[PDB]
């Protein structure tokens, strides 16, 4: 199938309490492999997955230096944006950046990304063409202009279409036994009477990968999506994910309910019934 590499940067200012906290994490699909944290003792880009550990010292010194150059850029960017929105010097603000590339089953480049946010909302984003930008407001318009005069997009595109996919393919090869796999979900149902007239039916999905999944409750074949409660997919901590969907059914009608699970792993959509 297709694969992706994605990095996430978060810079949180903290006036008076020192320089802003910078955190970066790298991912290949749904598996993290590196991380940098300014509030950590190492002050180095560190490994978060066994397979990235085969990279020599020069790799780590490079990532550290280049990711530190990034904290430097974000540190001052935090200041100018504060200006753009005429915000006080004592407030805490955050800049988030996400960027990466997707490749298909043959390792070919499909698309690249680069999107930035300020205080939890979109600020500016590189368009699919990797040649133009989309500013969310008048402030980002100031940045859009500066970024055009500097031909910033060209630099981004060169990376997204070059080293981004080159290294994405490399990681997929170096950690093939762990990255190129799909763990189908293990499923079971639970039952909780809410009263003598109602009961909760919860459908579970455990130890699956990738994280993307679909859980649905049907009654007599009829889709019940609206009375169904779903929790956010969550990580088990071992590289697999979990998730459940629940539904409140009249005491005595549970036999009519069916849970359907859809995942890239399982050859065919599963179907669970109470009893």
């Amino acid at each position: 199938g297709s694969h992706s590499m994605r990095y996430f940067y978060t810079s949180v200012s903290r006036p008076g309490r020192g320089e802003p906290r910078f955190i970066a994490v790298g991912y290949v699909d749904d598996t993290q492999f590196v991380r940098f944290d300014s509030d950590a003792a190492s002050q180095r880009m560190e490994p978060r997955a066994p397979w990235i550990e085969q990279e020599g010292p020069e790799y780590w010194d490079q990532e550290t230096r280049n990711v530190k150059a990034q904290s430097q850029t974000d540190r001052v960017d935090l200041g100018t944006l504060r200006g753009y929105y005429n915000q006080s010097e004592d407030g805490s603000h955050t800049i988030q950046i996400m960027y990466g590339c997707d490749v298909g089953p043959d390792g070919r480049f499909l698309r690249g990304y680069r999107q930035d946010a300020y205080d939890g909302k979109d600020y500016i984003a590189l368009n699919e063409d990797l040649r133009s930008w989309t500013a969310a407001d008048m402030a980002a318009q100031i940045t859009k202009r500066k970024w055009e005069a500097a031909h910033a997009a060209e630099q981004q595109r060169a990376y997204l279409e070059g080293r981004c996919v080159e290294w994405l393919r490399r990681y997929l090869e170096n950690g093939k036994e762990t990255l190129q796999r799909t763990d189908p979900p293990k499923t079971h149902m639970t039952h909780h009477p809410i009263s003598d007239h109602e009961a909760t039916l919860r459908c579970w999905a455990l130890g699956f990968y990738p994280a993307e999944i679909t859980l649905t409750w049907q009654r007599d074949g009829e889709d019940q999506t609206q009375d169904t409660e779903l929790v956010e997919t969550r990580p088990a901590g071992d590289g697999t994910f979990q998730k459940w969907a629940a539904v409140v059914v009249p005491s005595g009608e549970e036999q009519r309910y069916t849970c359907h699970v859809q995942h890239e792993g399982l050859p065919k959509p599963l179907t669970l019934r109470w009893e």
Binding site: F8, T10, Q32, G120, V231, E232, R234, P235, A236, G237
Partner: protein, 100 residues
């Protein structure tokens, strides 16, 4: 500015079985800003040396984080997660429930 309340989930990596090593998880997602205070508890007392993943975020820029610790369940021991964030009135406590 934008503020989002964290969704809190307390659970184990594997189905709980007394006497068998497992991991206790507290996943908090969909929150903003990033500053958040999370603790795993055992019999009301704060568990020492708990680890957590590296701050990352989703589609909508909301953050998510996983706090975990290695433990082996017993019939009487009770666990829970304690969470605080600007969006919450006071520290919120969510108990771990095996057979959820």
């Amino acid at each position: 500015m934008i503020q989002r309340t964290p969704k809190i989930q307390v659970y184990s990596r594997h189905p709980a079985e007394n006497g068998k090593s497992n991991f206790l998880n507290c996943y908090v997602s969909g929150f903003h800003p990033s500053d958040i205070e999370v603790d795993l508890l055992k019999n009301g007392e704060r568990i020492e040396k708990v680890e957590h993943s590296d701050l990352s975020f989703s589609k909508d820029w909301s953050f998510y984080l996983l706090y975990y610790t290695e433990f082996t369940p017993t019939e009487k021991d009770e666990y829970a997660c304690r969470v605080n964030h600007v969006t919450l009135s006071q520290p919120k406590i969510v108990k771990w429930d095996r057979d959820m």
